[PDB]
Amino acid sequence: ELLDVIKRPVITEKSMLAMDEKKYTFEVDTRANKTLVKQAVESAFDVKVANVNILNVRPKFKRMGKYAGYTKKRRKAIVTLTEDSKEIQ
Amino acid sequence: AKVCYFTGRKTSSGNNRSHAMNSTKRTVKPNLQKVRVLIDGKPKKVWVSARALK
Amino acid sequence: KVKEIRELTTAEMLDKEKQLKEELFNLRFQLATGQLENTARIKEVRQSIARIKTVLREQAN
RNA sequence: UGCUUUACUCUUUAAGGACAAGUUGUGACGGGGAGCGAAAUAGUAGCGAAGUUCCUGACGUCACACUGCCAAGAAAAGCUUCUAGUGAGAAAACAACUGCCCGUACCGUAAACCGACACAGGUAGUCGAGGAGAGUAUCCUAAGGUGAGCGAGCGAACUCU
RNA sequence: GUAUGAGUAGCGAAAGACAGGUGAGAAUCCUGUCCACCGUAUGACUAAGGUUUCCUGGGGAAGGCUCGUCCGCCCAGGGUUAGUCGGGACCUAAGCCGAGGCCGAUAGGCGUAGGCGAUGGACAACAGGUUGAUAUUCCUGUACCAGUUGUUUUUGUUUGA
RNA sequence: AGCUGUAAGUAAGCUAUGAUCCAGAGAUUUCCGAAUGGGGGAACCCAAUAUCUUUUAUAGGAUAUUACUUUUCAGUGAAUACAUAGCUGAUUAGAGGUAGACGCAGAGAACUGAAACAUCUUAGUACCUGCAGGAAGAGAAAGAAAAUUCGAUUCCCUGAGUAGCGGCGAGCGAAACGGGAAGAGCCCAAACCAACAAGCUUGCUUGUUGGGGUUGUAGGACUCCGAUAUGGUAGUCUGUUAGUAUAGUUGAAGGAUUUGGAAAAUUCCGCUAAAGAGGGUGAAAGCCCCGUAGACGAAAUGCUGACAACACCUAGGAGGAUCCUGAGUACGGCGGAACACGAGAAAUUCCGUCGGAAUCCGCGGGGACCAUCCCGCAAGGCUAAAUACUCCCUAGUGACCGA
């Protein structure tokens, strides 16, 4: 179903520094392999392997109004390339 | 000894009086025997009361 | 929205499904990078995909 | 043809076989370093000289290796062969690609664990230097880390050390 | 809810002093110097356990047994990257569930085959550099294990492949 | 004709092509959970067989099927040949939850009372467990009676704290007669006769299907004559209408002055009512708003009547040679329980064991037992209503509460 693989790019202080070595930080939905993300990126941007790396995130608190609730789980994806770029973001 | 296969005899319970009428609780059980019978031609082994062996 | 969706063939339904999913990719990446003066087009692509899938549900019983 | 075993003939510090801490080259024109030190506002970037000999030397390793003793000291898989069998023609070299899911921050003889507390208590494992010295004892110290989360005066009774 | 006890007892073992900073406000925060304490541990690494306490930039109403410009506290943003490390796609000990089955007022109890279960077995990567936080995980160099695609020298499925 | 919930706030939009909202039908429905491919520390991991997918290719992805037991049918099978275990495949049903309520069963306490305590009481209560249903249980006389009789069951009043039981102590405690609520009765086994198969000795015994047949005034077979109509239903989610439940429409009549921040309050003069019940509005409103009385209305789905169709079911009179009418059943001894009844002079109902009848000239009962009389036919099934409860829905009420 591989357009529900990738959601968003991550725009942070390390993620902009990953841009210099052709590395890109996407958010992949839960229960997805490394191989789906390779196939989805090759489908959507015409670039290659040089393997993905995949994280996870434990949630937090926040408090607003005497209430106590978590946030979402996440899963980052730091995809490296060999030969093309993405001046898209 | 759990049931009969033909009749409906099963173990039960009742009192026990003794000579100044003090009551306790018994286990009144039926006489039962493991008998090889012919259920649909093929022999089994099953519990049958002696009452149905007359 | 509904009516001309009921005017199409069968394959063109699937073609518009693919086009609307690619527009959802484009609206996601253009929300993450601080863009999209229109943000109320996100309901429209979703509900268009929904109406297309119900129309394909009815015709195959 | 593998394995086991009984009888007979030889053979024996011999030969065959099995394991082995470690050394020397390569790796390595590499990175490491006492110290120098900017070009803005950094001891930053960038530059590096020596790699010797003797002495003591481990229950760390060979390794449960060896002798002794009685209290007589886990299993199954991985591995290796031989047949049963299945049964186009795979099997070395070279080159290019593929290799899934979960944990990884931090505290961890403690202010972040167990004791209602930022509590004189408890917490399994490994490393654990120097001078004296049998030593992980005791006294003072290296590498490192702390100065304790109420004070300032005065220097009576009385209580504690 | 508020008194009395009363502005009393206590402030939870340890050595600080000065100069210069910032600030409305300083013994208690930052920096510098000297002094002092542990040093088989108050030093380093991990297993449990805790669950964001980690880092960056702000804040001083409550918490901190005093003060506080500070904090493990409040707000906002941000950090945990693996073919080789520990576990799964391998094995079994204690124990547990146990198709059929054997017993038992109901409920249910016990047990063969087959399983589940690490504290144990078996198993392919080393040195350095790098950031505000990650590193046998990122890059630098050199390896290793299991495969897949083109090349590499041999034919009855009898095996003589 | 306004809208994007709480919830202000910003920025984007939607609607006269009828949004938002309401009502009835549909569609989609991640992962655990009886969990059901295998495993597990619930919301996790790991598979197999087909089909389609990505890549030069393995790795990667997606869809479908795969638990256990039993109901039936096939193959397969073998200690041991014949076929029974067993295995395999297909087919049929279950498996868990509540409503902390009501019902039926199994098993079953103690404190307390007796001014102590042993039989007794608390009490077949509390608790556990199985089984269901919208209700369940009981139900068509082996009955209640004592005549002069009545005719299935359940529930209510009364009989009555009476007759009774009880270390005759504490205490437990009915039933029939009478008045009411609601009303209903049906189907088998047997004896007999056919159709088939078997040891069919071709004796016609057994087994299955189809007709027959259901009772105490005894009835049925069997025989002989009639006879082929009359009448009911406790079925058919098959039609055709009537109504109803879930959105709604319409719905009368008032102005000025004074005190006011603001009037519904006050003072004058009016109007309405099949509507003067209630709520809201800058204070206390028949005439401002929402309503109320009345009147009207349903595309879709469900429910209830009705009456059509279709299913079913139901015959008379006489005879009395032979045949049938529920078996290890009734009943007895022993040991326990249930009946208000605690072995008591102990009938009637069950349970465990051991004995164990008759066949209409028969059998049971009328509180040990006998005789006479009277009333009844057990040992096979089904059955509406009157009765008890409320997790939830709609519409209401209270000399019920006001933090």
Tell me the structure's resolution in angstroms, rounded to a single decimal.
Answer: 3.5
* Structure determination method: cryo-EM
CB contact under 8 A, A9 and C24: no
**Burial of residue C32, with CB atoms counted within 10 A of its CB: 0-12 exposed, 13-18 middle, 19 or more buried:** middle
Angle CA C34–C35–C38, to nearest 5: 135
- Domain chopping of chain A, boundaries: 1-89
For residue A38, give the nucleotide whose C1' atom is nearest its CA: F60
HEC states along chain B?
Answer: CCCCCCCCCCCCCCCCCCCCCCCCCCCCCCCCEEECCEECCEECCEEECHHHHC
Residue C7 structural domain: 1-61
- The number of domains in chain C is 1
> Chain A closest CA to C59's CA: distance in Å?
23
